[PDB]
Design a protein around this ligand. Structure first.
Ligand SMILES: [Zn+2]
Lengths: 50, 148, 97, 144, 148
């Protein structure tokens, strides 16, 4: 904005290709991938005979 | 084969009753000509003061109305028509409300003026109007409102 | 934006006092409405306003020293201001001797 | 006893008196006393006047508009103007904090709520949270 | 079933005692109205001068307090309430401290005014208040502080 010589300016994380919270979402996914895969080893793979 | 009559929201005209409802804690709804339509409430508990909110809807379990302190003015209440929240609602936004004077076309091809005295809607949403001096009910498309 | 940048201020409108002498067209020296000034004022109203270039211009004269300050203000929407209206900023203090 | 004060409790009554048009008197804290009024005529709106003294041949009240808030009315003390007595000549007014010694000669703080007098002007005070009376000498003003 | 009474930090009122503690080298803690809360110390060793620090915490093995020279003013000590570090702490930030006068609700539905004379907390952290003219202890939510 510009009013009588006063101007207020802002640039944000929102972008045409990424959302505002996409950065945190990306980090969250990164944490989950390590966490989820590590938790899978606690249970192991399934198996059925045939 | 129609829905029962639907009542219009009565604006409260006298200040004394409005304050009386407010003292009891019943919510008011005020329309400001310039800015917005707002709710007014006197604070619960012993810490008494006036509160204002803009969360214009019934207090659903998933819709929590939020309140903030404001110094409401007496003149604001007087000049602006005010309603009780329990009546003012989307349930009826009739084009011509009750007590409205309209010009309606008669069988003799003469346009007479009459007041709406009763309102009800069919299952399809068309509003049926009862008019002074007439027995049957009238339809919205047939009517004309003369302003000024 | 105006509320964000502005400073809280009291606003009182101005109107000519009835005490003006009808013949000389000039006011009484001391009446409650105006204390010698030819203009009265209305009850205060609260408002937020922006101000720039607050200046204390001082003139040293034969009559003495005198302050002729100048400043520029930016207001809110829908507010109509009148000539010789009056503003006062309680928060800001000015030193004098 | 003296009946110099007749505070209004319910705002509904205040509005009712305002509808009747009688002038009110509203107290302020560390600030000048004010009078309030409902305007006559077609348009009804609240008016205020900083003039307290009685209307007279040499003194006329000055009224102006204002957007008064109910919050001041509901909280601050309110009176009928004509019924108000300017002062009650006692050392410690009501709601004034004093230090007093209880019955067991232990000292406690209290605020005053009573107006009693003989026909000579001797006054007595009853403290909030207390029953019996206390004299002008017994009580001691608590400094801010 | 509660914790023993917790003491309030006593502001030091007289200059003479404050200097006496300072000469011994005991640390002071000063609150500045404008800028910050600071510690004050007279330098160890023979090279004597006043020192100021902003490392507001107990001298843990992993928290080394750092000092810098400053010309502390007498008037600063007088006007600003000062404490001894050994008392002023997070151990008690009670809402109503000792010697505070409060308005409390009595059994007879009368609000009387009384001073807090003793303070202790239950294991859950709720502060119990002893009041003049009363035997039992009172809870924070019940109380009201009247200011001015
Ligand atoms: Zn004048």
């Amino acid at each position: 904005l510009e009013v009588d010589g006063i101007t207020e300016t802002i640039g944000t994380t929102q972008s045409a290709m990424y959302g505002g919270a996409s950065a945190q979402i990306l980090q969250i996914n990164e944490d989950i991938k390590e966490l989820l895969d590590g938790l899978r080893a606690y249970f192991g793979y399934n198996m059925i005979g045939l | 084969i129609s829905l029962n009559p639907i009542q219009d929201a009565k604006p409260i005209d006298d200040i004394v009753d409005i304050m009386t409802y407010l003292k009891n804690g019943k919510v008011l709804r005020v329309k400001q000509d310039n800015q917005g339509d707002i709710l007014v409430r006197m604070s619960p508990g012993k810490h008494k003061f006036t509160e204002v909110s803009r969360d214009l809807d019934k207090e659903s379990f998933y819709y929590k109305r939020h309140w903030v302190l404001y110094n409401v003015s007496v003149n604001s209440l007087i000049t602006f028509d005010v309603y009780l929240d329990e009546e003012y609602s989307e349930t009826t936004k009739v084009k011509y409300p009750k007590d409205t004077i309209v010009e309606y076309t008669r069988e003799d091809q003469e346009k007479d003026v009459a007041m709406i005295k009763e309102i009800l809607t069919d299952n399809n949403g068309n509003y049926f109007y009862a008019l002074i001096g007439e027995t049957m009910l009238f339809d919205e498309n047939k009517l004309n409102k003369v302003k000024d | 934006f105006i509320n964000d940048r502005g400073i809280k201020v009291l606003w009182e409108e101005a109107y000519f006092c009835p005490c003006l002498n009808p013949d000389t067209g000039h006011p009484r020296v001391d009446c409650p409405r105006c204390h010698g000034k030819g203009i009265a004022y209305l009850p205060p109203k609260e408002t937020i306003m922006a101000i720039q270039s607050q200046e204390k211009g001082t003139n040293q004269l034969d009559i003495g020293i005198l302050d002729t300050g100048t400043a520029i203000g930016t207001t809110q929407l829908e507010k109509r201001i009148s000539y010789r209206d009056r503003f006062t900023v309680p928060e800001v203090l000015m030193p004098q001797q």
